[PDB]
Amino acid sequence: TWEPPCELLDCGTNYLLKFEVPGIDKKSLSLQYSNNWVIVSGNKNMPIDEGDFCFTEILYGQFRREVPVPVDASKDGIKAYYQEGILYVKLLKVSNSNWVNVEIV
C-alpha cells in the first residue's frame, strides 16, 4: 500500500541504512537480511482510536521495501534501532569479497 523512503550512508567501519517510518506499529516492524539484500516490512494502523479524520495526507497500511547492499556488507553483527521515527540498520563491513569472474562466450 506504500513504500518508505530510505537512505544508505557509508560511515567507514559500517554502513547505516535508514528508513523513514514515522508512527508505525513498532510491534509490526520486521526486517530480515539475505544475500546482501535488506527487507523491511511493517504496518501503519489508522488512528481509529484517536479520533475521526478531518483530512489526512498520511499514507496508512502495509509497507515493504527490498534494498540492495554493497558487497563488503556482512550478515554477522547487524543491529537495528527505531528512533525519532527512523529505522536504522547498522551493517558491518566484512573485508574479504569472493570476487568470482565469469567467462563470456
Add this chain to the structure above:
Amino acid sequence: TWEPPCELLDCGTNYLLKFEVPGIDKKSLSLQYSNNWVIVSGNKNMPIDEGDFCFTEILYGQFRREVPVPVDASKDGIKAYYQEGILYVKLLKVSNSNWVNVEI
C-alpha cells in the same frame, strides 16, 4: 522548502493536528498559533556527522507549513508534543456548554 505531510483529527474534547517530521532538528523546531492558523517550521539537516551518502531519497532542508484550523478550536490550552517522528498539536474545542463534568 519542503512540506511535511499533516493530518487533522476530531476527538470531541480536542482537535489533534499531526505532522510527519522524522529526524528533524529538535532545537530548530518552531510552532506558532495565530488566527485559526497553525504554522510549523524547522530544519531536517543532512547527516554529515553520521556518514557519507551512497544514495538517499530523503528530503532534507528547511520546512514550513501553514495549516488552517477549524473555528471551534480554542486559542488557549494548546499543547504540542514530539514523539516517534511525529509532532502532535492538541487544540481544545471552544466549549458551548456551561456544564462541567466532575472527574471523581
Add this chain to the structure above:
Amino acid sequence: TWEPPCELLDCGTNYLLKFEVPGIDKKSLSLQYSNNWVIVSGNKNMPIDEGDFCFTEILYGQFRREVPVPVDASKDGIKAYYQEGILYVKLLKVSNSNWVNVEIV
C-alpha cells in the same frame, strides 16, 4: 567513463541480465560476480582506424556498471553469452536460502 544501459528479465527457471554494449573491444569485456552484485566493464576506443570525426553522438572510453541482482540469484552456474552488441548473463534461481532476522531494539 560512461555506463551501458541494462535490463533484468525473469524467465522462471533463471534470470536474464542484459547490457547493451555495441561496438566495444570484445577482448576488453570483463564480467565479475560477488555477493549478488554483477560488475561489467570494458573499453570502447575511438575509430581512429576508420576515419576522423565529423560529428558523433556515441560514448567512447572506459565503462563499468555495478548492478545488484535479486535475492534468489545463485552464486553458482552463471553463463555469459555475447551476441550482436548485447552481453547476456543467465543467472540461476536458488533453492534453499539463509536469512537473518534482525531485532529492532
Add this chain to the structure above:
Amino acid sequence: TWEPPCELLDCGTNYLLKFEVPGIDKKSLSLQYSNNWVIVSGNKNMPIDEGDFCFTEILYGQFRREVPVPVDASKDGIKAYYQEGILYVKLLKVSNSNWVNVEIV
C-alpha cells in the same frame, strides 16, 4: 518513436555514417537516400519470448532518424552493412579529378 545515436566519419575517399542499433528487428529495417538526406527507420520488439521485465533502461518500439550528409557526398555507390548491433552506411565522395588511379593486381 525513439532515435538511435549516430556518428559521421570522414574516411577520406568516403564517409561512414554509423547508427547504434543493438538488437532491432533485422527485418523491417529501412534505409533511404535522397538529396543529401539519409533516412533510417525500423522497429525493435520487446522480448515477450525471453522473460518478464524486472526493470529496463533499453528503449523499445519503432525508431526513425533523418541525417543530412555533407555537400561533398555522392548520391551514387552507397552501401549499407549491418553488423554487431551497428548499422554502417558508406557514402562515396563526388570525384574531384579526371585521372583515375589504376590498382595493379
